[PDB]
Design an enzyme around this catalytic site. Structure first.
Site, mmCIF file in Angstrom:
data_model
loop_
_atom_site.group_PDB
_atom_site.id
_atom_site.type_symbol
_atom_site.label_atom_id
_atom_site.label_comp_id
_atom_site.label_asym_id
_atom_site.label_seq_id
_atom_site.Cartn_x
_atom_site.Cartn_y
_atom_site.Cartn_z
ATOM 1 C CB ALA A 1 10.257 15.028 22.776
ATOM 2 C CG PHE A 2 10.966 15.403 17.138
ATOM 3 C CD1 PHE A 2 10.047 15.159 16.084
ATOM 4 C CD2 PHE A 2 11.938 14.447 17.409
ATOM 5 C CE1 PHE A 2 10.018 13.955 15.423
ATOM 6 C CE2 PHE A 2 11.953 13.263 16.686
ATOM 7 C CZ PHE A 2 11.014 13.037 15.663
ATOM 8 C CE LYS A 22 13.127 16.070 13.984
ATOM 9 N NZ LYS A 22 14.551 15.721 14.183
ATOM 10 C CG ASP A 32 19.410 12.845 22.073
ATOM 11 O OD1 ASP A 32 19.394 12.074 23.032
ATOM 12 O OD2 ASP A 32 18.373 13.211 21.507
HETATM 13 O O1 LIG Z 1 13.491 7.214 7.398
HETATM 14 C C1 LIG Z 1 13.932 8.199 7.996
HETATM 15 N N1 LIG Z 1 14.741 9.142 7.461
HETATM 16 C C2 LIG Z 1 15.070 10.217 8.378
HETATM 17 C C3 LIG Z 1 14.361 9.792 9.631
HETATM 18 C C4 LIG Z 1 14.333 10.367 10.901
HETATM 19 C C5 LIG Z 1 13.593 9.775 11.917
HETATM 20 C C6 LIG Z 1 12.868 8.602 11.667
HETATM 21 C C7 LIG Z 1 12.075 7.701 12.499
HETATM 22 C C8 LIG Z 1 11.679 7.780 13.935
HETATM 23 C C9 LIG Z 1 11.477 9.007 14.534
HETATM 24 C C10 LIG Z 1 11.106 9.083 15.866
HETATM 25 C C11 LIG Z 1 10.926 7.929 16.609
HETATM 26 C C12 LIG Z 1 11.111 6.695 16.007
HETATM 27 O O2 LIG Z 1 10.907 5.548 16.722
HETATM 28 C C13 LIG Z 1 11.493 6.613 14.678
HETATM 29 C C14 LIG Z 1 11.676 6.676 11.671
HETATM 30 N N2 LIG Z 1 12.145 6.880 10.397
HETATM 31 C C15 LIG Z 1 12.883 8.039 10.377
HETATM 32 C C16 LIG Z 1 13.633 8.648 9.370
#
Ligand SMILES: O=C1N=Cc2ccc3c(-c4cccc(O)c4)c[nH]c3c21
Ligand SMILES: [Cl-]
Ligand code: NA
Length: 338
Positions: free
Chosen positions: A26-27, A46, A143
């Site tokens: 969503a973000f 992110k 969450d």
């Molecule tokens: O390697 C990481 N280090 C911090 C981090 C935060 C979020 C993610 C997501 C992610 C985000 C949204 C949806 C989804 O299906 C996967 C994948 N890798 C991430 C990392």
């Protein structure tokens, strides 16, 4: 505008070169980048939508991560490490250590097959220890869900399983970290009226009775079920239906919670306002059954897991097992054996 700025080869903050997309929620999006000013380290960035509520969540996430990461500089408790943050074309961008697949994406890429019990045990223990560290610091995650639990490294082996007629992926190392602290709330802060992603949301949240750390425990019990089965036992997008499913799986809501709730829309007198013969009613009857009927084995290790899940899914949030207590449950004894 999100689509305009997240492309492979784009360079952020004069240092982070995008090489892949890791996820989108969503973000906004999470991208994998090469950090040209830290020796070519790969990191996760992110990229947050330029929208009020997501910007606020990101700012809050940065504050919580700064706290948690300063409190636990060795990451002994497995919260993701934030490296820095910056702004790119007006968007907030948070840089993290790079992790592997989320537990949800792993299950999805494995054909929605569940994890094996020994991996669930290890994962559960680490989830509980990490979230307990949040609880010890006057925080509630709010969450927790499989998308927010990431493997440190998600390499796998693959083999045909003739017991189920399917190719199966098995993690080499199931270590995890917890991510997404944009909803995390301190004890003395305003508590949003609604929290959690529906399938992981506690009954005190639904009934607006007030929530705190215990709502995280409920979410964890739901996550463990999903790891064990490959699917949720609450397959719904409606609050009242969710309560009906809880009733079928866990038994009737406590009278004191129905007594106290302002959420009268769900109730007819002192009972759920629920038509068992409607479309939704027929589905709940088909799709739900008492919790222990979902067990795949009666072996004692399965009984130990289910006993823990049942404690985590206690309706009354004060009675509900805490994570400190969960860490001492018999399910984990196998991990403490010399
Ligand atoms: O390697 C990481 N280090 C911090 C981090 C935060 C979020 C993610 C997501 C992610 C985000 C949204 C949806 C989804 O299906 C996967 C994948 N890798 C991430 C990392
Ligand atoms: Cl066990
Ligand atoms: Na009513």
């Amino acid at each position: 505008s999100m689509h305009l700025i997240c492309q492979s080869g784009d360079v952020l903050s004069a240092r982070y070169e995008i090489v892949d997309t890791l996820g989108e929620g969503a973000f906004g999006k999470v991208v994998e980048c090469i950090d040209h000013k830290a020796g070519g380290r790969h990191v996760a960035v992110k990229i947050v939508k330029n929208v009020d509520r997501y910007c606020e969540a990101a700012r809050s996430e940065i504050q919580v991560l700064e706290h948690l990461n300063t409190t636990d500089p060795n990451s002994t408790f497995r919260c993701v490490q934030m490296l820095e943050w910056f702004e790119h074309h007006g968007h907030i961008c948070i840089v993290f250590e790079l992790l592997g697949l989320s537990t949800y994406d792993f299950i999805k890429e494995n054909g929605f097959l569940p994890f094996r019990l020994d991996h669930i045990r290890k994962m559960a223990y680490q989830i509980c220890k990490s979230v307990n560290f949040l609880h010890s610091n006057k925080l509630t995650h709010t969450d927790l869900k499989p998308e927010n639990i990431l493997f440190v490294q998600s390499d796998y082996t693959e083999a045909y399983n003739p017991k189920i007629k399917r190719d199966e992926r098995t993690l080499i190392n199931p270590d995890i970290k917890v991510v997404d602290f944009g909803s995390a709330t301190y004890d003395d802060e305003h508590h949003s009226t609604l929290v959690s992603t529906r399938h992981y949301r506690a009954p005190e949240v639904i009934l607006a009775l007030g929530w705190s750390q215990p709502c995280d425990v409920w979410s964890i019990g739901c996550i463990l079920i999903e790891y064990y089965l490959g699917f949720t036992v609450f397959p719904t997008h409606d609050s009242k239906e969710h309560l009906a499913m809880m009733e079928r799986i866990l038994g009737p809501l406590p009278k004191h919670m129905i007594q106290k709730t302002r959420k009268r829309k769900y109730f007819h007198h002192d009972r759920l306002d629920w038509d068992e013969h409607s479309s939704a009613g027929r589905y709940v009857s088909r799709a739900c059954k008492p919790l222990k009927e979902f067990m795949l084995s009666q072996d004692v290790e399965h009984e130990r897991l289910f006993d823990l899940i049942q404690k985590m899914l206690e309706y009354d949030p004060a009675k509900r097992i805490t994570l400190r207590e969960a860490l001492k449950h018999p399910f984990f004894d196998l991990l403490k054996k010399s």
